[PDB]
Symmetry: D2
Amino acid sequence: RADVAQLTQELGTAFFQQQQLPAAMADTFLEHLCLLDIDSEPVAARSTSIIATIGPASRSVERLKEMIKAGMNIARLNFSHGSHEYHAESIANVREAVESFAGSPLSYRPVAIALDTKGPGSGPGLSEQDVRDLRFGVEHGVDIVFASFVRKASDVAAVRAALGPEGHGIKIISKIENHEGVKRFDEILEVSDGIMVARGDLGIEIPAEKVFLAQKMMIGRCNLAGKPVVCATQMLESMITKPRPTRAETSDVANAVLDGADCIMLSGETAKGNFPVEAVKMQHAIAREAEAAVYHRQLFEELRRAAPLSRDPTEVTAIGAVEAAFKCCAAAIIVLTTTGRSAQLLSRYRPRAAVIAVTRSAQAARQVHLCRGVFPLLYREPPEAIWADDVDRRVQFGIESGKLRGFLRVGDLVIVVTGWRPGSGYTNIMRVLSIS
Amino acid sequence: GTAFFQQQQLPAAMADTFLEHLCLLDIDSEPVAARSTSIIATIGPASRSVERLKEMIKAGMNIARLNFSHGSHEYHAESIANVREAVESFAGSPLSYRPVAIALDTKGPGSGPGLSEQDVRDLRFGVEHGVDIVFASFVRKASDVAAVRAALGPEGHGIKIISKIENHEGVKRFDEILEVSDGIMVARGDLGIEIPAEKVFLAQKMMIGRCNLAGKPVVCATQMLESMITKPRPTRAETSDVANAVLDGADCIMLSGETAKGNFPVEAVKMQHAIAREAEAAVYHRQLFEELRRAAPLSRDPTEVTAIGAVEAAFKCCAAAIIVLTTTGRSAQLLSRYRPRAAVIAVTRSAQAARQVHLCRGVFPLLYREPPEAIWADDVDRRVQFGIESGKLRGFLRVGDLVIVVTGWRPGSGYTNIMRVLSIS
Amino acid sequence: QQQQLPAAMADTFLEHLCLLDIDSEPVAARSTSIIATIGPASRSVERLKEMIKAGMNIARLNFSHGSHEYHAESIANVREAVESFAGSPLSYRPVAIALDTKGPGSGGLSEQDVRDLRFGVEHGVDIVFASFVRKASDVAAVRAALGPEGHGIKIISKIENHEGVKRFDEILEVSDGIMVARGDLGIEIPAEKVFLAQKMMIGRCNLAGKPVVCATQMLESMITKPRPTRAETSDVANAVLDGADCIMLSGETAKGNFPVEAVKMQHAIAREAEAAVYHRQLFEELRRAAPLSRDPTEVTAIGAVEAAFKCCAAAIIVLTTTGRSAQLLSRYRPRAAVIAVTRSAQAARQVHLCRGVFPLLYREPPEAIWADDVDRRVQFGIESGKLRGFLRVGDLVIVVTGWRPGSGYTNIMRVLSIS
Amino acid sequence: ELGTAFFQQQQLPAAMADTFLEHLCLLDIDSEPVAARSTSIIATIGPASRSVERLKEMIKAGMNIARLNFSHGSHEYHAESIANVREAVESFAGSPLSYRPVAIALDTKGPPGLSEQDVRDLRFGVEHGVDIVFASFVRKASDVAAVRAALGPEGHGIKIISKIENHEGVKRFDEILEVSDGIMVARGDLGIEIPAEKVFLAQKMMIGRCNLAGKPVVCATQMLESMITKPRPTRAETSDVANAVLDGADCIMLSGETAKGNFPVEAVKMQHAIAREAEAAVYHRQLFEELRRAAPLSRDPTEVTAIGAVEAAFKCCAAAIIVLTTTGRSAQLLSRYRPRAAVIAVTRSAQAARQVHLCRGVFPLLYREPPEAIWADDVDRRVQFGIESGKLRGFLRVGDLVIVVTGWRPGSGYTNIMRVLSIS
Ligand SMILES: O=C1c2ccccc2C(=O)c2c1cc(S(=O)(=O)N1CCC[C@@H](C(=O)O)C1)c(O)c2O
Ligand SMILES: O=C1c2ccccc2C(=O)c2c1cc(S(=O)(=O)N1CCC[C@@H](C(=O)O)C1)c(O)c2O
Ligand SMILES: O=C1c2ccccc2C(=O)c2c1cc(S(=O)(=O)N1CCC[C@@H](C(=O)O)C1)c(O)c2O
Ligand SMILES: O=P(O)(O)OC[C@H]1O[C@](O)(COP(=O)(O)O)[C@@H](O)[C@@H]1O
Ligand SMILES: O=P(O)(O)OC[C@H]1O[C@](O)(COP(=O)(O)O)[C@@H](O)[C@@H]1O
Ligand SMILES: O=P(O)(O)OC[C@H]1O[C@](O)(COP(=O)(O)O)[C@@H](O)[C@@H]1O
Ligand SMILES: O=P(O)(O)OC[C@H]1O[C@](O)(COP(=O)(O)O)[C@@H](O)[C@@H]1O
Ligand SMILES: O=C([O-])C(=O)[O-]
Ligand SMILES: O=C([O-])C(=O)[O-]
Ligand SMILES: O=C([O-])C(=O)[O-]
Ligand SMILES: O=C([O-])C(=O)[O-]
Ligand SMILES: [K+]
Ligand SMILES: [K+]
Ligand SMILES: [K+]
Ligand SMILES: [K+]
Ligand SMILES: [Mg+2]
Ligand SMILES: [Mg+2]
Ligand SMILES: [Mg+2]
Ligand SMILES: [Mg+2]
């Protein structure tokens, strides 16, 4: 009680009853579980991104606007089905629905476009259809590739080569779907931007009762590496035909978030099912409850103990910023980023504070949805003559957007993360600011 | 041997942090220990036949649930008779015989304020037919438990009352309900309709954590393998749900439609068995034992004191089993609350206690049928030897293993006070 | 590796002790300040220069003995010895002057204490060690006796009896810090209980983030012998391991035959003991127990100490007017030296009360642009650090500054690569 | 119940703290020690402490081990000191409440290897039935093998405590500890052989490694040095004694303080008083957790029974752990886990009763009743003897819980049983 007494008097007892804060202050994981309360309402914005598969049930512009409002952050196009013409029309409809909210940063919501490959099939490596689909992805400006059946590091090098010189910025998320992918996980993660636990094929390739071990191991290793991990397949399966999920399905979504997944996915639930919008809404509601139930006290301690020492100033600033945010219950960490990297390094420490990433790159704003707790703000103003003024203006844009969108309130403390010179790679400053 | 330390997720078990423990989980590290989380199967048309019940007992069913919301007293009396016939068909091999508990799940109060008249009649039927456990529906407060206990009468004092928490009031008054109950059931079906569906996992984790702290059994129930009512294999969310209920700390997991009315009752039991075994090896005992000891209050009860000493000793030598003599099951329950990796082999003469201890994780009941020896010390020894011989036959023990043996200083319940380290010959 | 780094990486406190190595040489600068009592054996300017070189950070004047004229001459000699090194601003070492009161005797605040406290204000003393503090009102009386001109003087309450120990929380609340005055404490309470009072008071001061001094008979045999006993070296090392911000010498420097050697011995033991601190547990416990705060100086301090540990920073350079921003960094016990750049000569002297704070008195011409003036004070911290052996080219440092001039606005932490 | 007063004594509020920092903050000068003093006191016997009357006062003050320093005196002089110690010890055999075994330890003069004088002094020790040898200047494992060989055919049961006194002994510590029964941190010579400011590092390291190995460690030299001429010690001296106990030392020692000083009895009394306060201040919650985590898994039933017994004693705040032992080994394995409960060791071996003073928290009871024909009755008689002596000495009262450690058959090496008994 003495460690939270002054802040309880200042912020109030109602503040410390919400977002599972009594469970968050527990001294053991067992006590943390005992203190979880169904009446402790989540307050923070939902941090785990939702990937929705686009298909016949979720293709129209009107339906896509509803899905964006329900919480869809990434639109997945499964190239195992449909044609290039079909998927190009789906991409155009996603972009039209996204741009319908472009009138202001308060309404605008970047949505990433991910291409999920058909896979190698019976062949030992990159198929000819995958080469054509990957070229289609580059030509249509996709942000992410979910590479099917990645079994070794050379599979991801082949996907990278097939994206060519114009697709260097596309994120490659390797799908682990069989025994070989699980056994060679370390070499695959090393060369990938992230991982997808593709439980559909994994549950057929290895005994079904072992999938949870592979999921927990891969999520843990991605969390340790600071790289995005997606939990996928049959999360809310019964919602393909029913308006409400089973007890096992809500438990599965909550446990994927508690395991440490950066993203959760919907496949048949959004692509063909009768309730695509409701499936997104259900994942949104469960993820916010589960994020508040994360035991940050142990998680942050373990991420520090396991992470090696670093001489990279972005990494050093990120841990100092997350430590400062926890000390004052900061409402947000505002970070300036060109490629999304400074926001990714804050996200790896799993702050409770929202990471508001201010960027001029439309592609980086879409791709940062892969990192838990990163809320992208696309800045469109032309650069100021004095660089320091341009930096200040972007921070103020973050603060004003934050207040207008309810993330920030007068009296809140925010942590601001910036660098000492222009260009990517120079983040080295952390500032504590009081919102007025 | 090196092979010993590669099995049962032992590299993950030796990790210094929970994060590193997760990173070290290996799909090729095979489970070796016997499955410790009990399986409750609901009895219905898909699982009433004596021959089908024998297959369910072989697949791993430990408790048969009778849902009194369906069928007459004559229907439930026939269910009980068929379960007893299937169970007793294996009694000719005493070293391998598996006791099976019979649990009566009540209809509940309905729109009524407390114990309904139909529940009074069903509870009296349960006492007259010798049921072991009552799963009391919609328990909202301590007085609901007292009413169930009063309705069981003087002949039903030994029946365990597991309170089902199915609504907001039951969750809010959980502490007072747990205090007077023998255990709890997280009845997720009604709970997921009474409170927002997205909050059920919080109530499940909280109740399992509190029951683990109290050392009382907790059952996770409803829709765990729902798709197996019609499909031969479960969904990815269903296998995950079963594994996470075990990792959360549930003593028992349950099947409802999957065994009462579905096409795959035996396969549903086999699936829960396979997942539970994998998940039990993935438990991070280093943190769990540390937290259970730290949170458990000091005690002057010799059974409790001997139990923590025995569990600590079992971990020190990687004991294959803790063999305990018990009259009521209490000495085995107090060992189980510390979650040893060693199997707790409970030797008892009480057929009812042998059935009821299935409520406690990691307790393997052995019903001893031999008449007492004239010398009490020789009777205790023969029971310990029966535990060892059953253990060897069932694969729990081998020559060279170390076992912890827990006994008491005089006959009768309540006098457990001795822990002994024994080498299997 | 050096500075007990194998013991520092251990997973348990037991394994940390098992890995302590007599051949692992200390590399960090000595963090625990040394307070030396000035008397007949340590009064001359020449002797005081040798004591400053040996490591004396605070000069204590015991008003239980001598006269106002005697102590004024001691103060003048300390100031002359200190200023003899002012010609090299990158290496100059400030030395605080502390006045230790006679006490209440058989009485609250005595009339002699009122006169001695007035003498302290008139002679610009930095600290008062208030004898026999037994309640919060004793501290208020000392503060009132210092008057309007003595508002900046630090009051370190000396706990010397049972009542002071029992009312410790109320005394610490209103004091700037505490002295565990073991001489009187060991006569007022059973001698075998003094270690419990010492460990409890050091622990509570560490929790409060306030300075604590361990005092009396630490190297007693060195009053007549050139080398201390085995118990004396152990006592000094254990006071540092307990968490003391300062260690003190009384008769050892005031009247003994080896005042310089006594200071050298405390310096050598403290350096060895500081490397043997188990920071892995200490930082985790200090971080867990320090309350949540909305004060930006407090928030920046924990972020800076966390960042320093992440990169093995050689130093945390902090700009401070009153010493407060450096004190808030010191409370988290970083392994990195806290180099405090200040223009206040008094703050530079007083900040010796906080473990791991190395004060640098800035006497360079001002810059017209405030951002440039801040930058030049940071470069001064770096150049003094390189000259003194704290920093080398290639090291990483954490820099702590504020958003506008004046005390109370520290809110920035920056990661900087040296040279 | 135990009462609120019970939980205010023996630093129990500090014992229940969740962190080491909180534990320090909760230490209370008004929380009185209740447990018997567990750290043994070794007193050096010389001119100031040689008479039978003076030795009786030193035994009453708390001396557990009498050290005879063969760097001085002669064989005839030390034989008379041994005879006087034995006469003073046996003067209390008429009262069960005051009879206490006292070990006799021979400290060698020291050395290229084993000196001719050490061979003769070690032979004198065997002939006079000494319990322990403090071997001076042990630098390597072969030095211990030479001492062990010199202990001839009759002295293989004598405990060899290696004195670490120089840089080489510190650097080769692991190999020395492996072959020794225990260690002495001989700070006098160590503080001359290595820089004085590094001695505390060698002391803390050696105490930590001995605690991890489950072997006795003695802290020695200048602990209460000023008491050679003064009636009261300095503040640094009381701190040094308390910190040696908090570091994990099994024994603390007095040299010139008892051998030639003006206040030998007062020096023993001061060590007794400080050790009792310091033992209550030990943070058992972390200590037990770390000893358990660092100790390897074991298939030895004595080791397995010992950890189970210590865990059980902490669970019920047991007043004592009563153990039957012939060699002292079962008591030593309980002692390595540092229980707060007193370890009452009931033995028929007078030698083991004297030697177990090397292990912290072991209170030996020498049992001399003729053996019962039924072995289970002989075990029950010894257990009841431990209980009745415990009630007579103030360790136990009716209603207390005790943990009892025995084996399944007679003979040393078979301890495998832990029982919880309610005192009647
Ligand atoms: O129905 C269409 C469709 C029809 C006509 C043109 C394009 C599509 C289409 O693109 C599509 C569909 C459905 C799904 S699904 O419901 O998720 N699907 C269910 C069975 C096959 C599974 C698999 O990929 O192995 C997943 C998709 O993942 C998907 O991308
Ligand atoms: O001898 C002088 C002296 C002689 C002539 C003029 C000034 C002084 C003097 O200022 C002084 C002395 C000695 C000490 S002491 O050795 O540390 N110590 C000895 C007695 C016990 C302690 C006490 O006050 O309770 C003091 C002092 O602390 C101290 O400041
Ligand atoms: O005075 C006698 C004495 C006189 C006449 C006959 C026997 C003795 C004697 O046996 C003795 C003495 C003194 C000590 S001491 O004061 O502890 N001392 C400290 C200095 C160096 C140490 C050394 O081991 O070399 C010895 C002893 O340790 C010690 O055992
Ligand atoms: O996260 P990234 O890709 O490293 O971008 C961070 C960069 O953004 C900045 O804050 C602002 O840079 P720009 O003015 O070029 O946008 C830099 O100081 C910093 O290096
Ligand atoms: O677990 P419970 O019900 O307390 O039973 C433990 C009892 O079992 C025993 O080991 C054997 O008793 P019985 O010979 O009466 O079966 C007793 O010594 C002990 O009190
Ligand atoms: O530690 P203190 O007393 O609060 O001083 C810190 C202050 O020093 C500064 O860094 C520099 O201030 P000045 O330029 O006035 O010296 C301020 O920005 C900050 O508020
Ligand atoms: O500690 P030690 O020397 O192994 O002695 C322990 C032995 O003491 C006993 O408890 C009693 O044995 P005895 O009857 O031979 O004395 C044995 O069962 C056990 O093996
Ligand atoms: O490919 C997938 O997404 C799968 O198999 O789950
Ligand atoms: O009653 C039940 O089992 C339920 O509602 O889940
Ligand atoms: O006044 C003091 O310094 C003392 O008594 O220790
Ligand atoms: O021999 C000893 O005891 C010493 O040197 O400390
Ligand atoms: K695909
Ligand atoms: K029912
Ligand atoms: K004074
Ligand atoms: K000697
Ligand atoms: Mg697939
Ligand atoms: Mg229900
Ligand atoms: Mg004093
Ligand atoms: Mg010596």
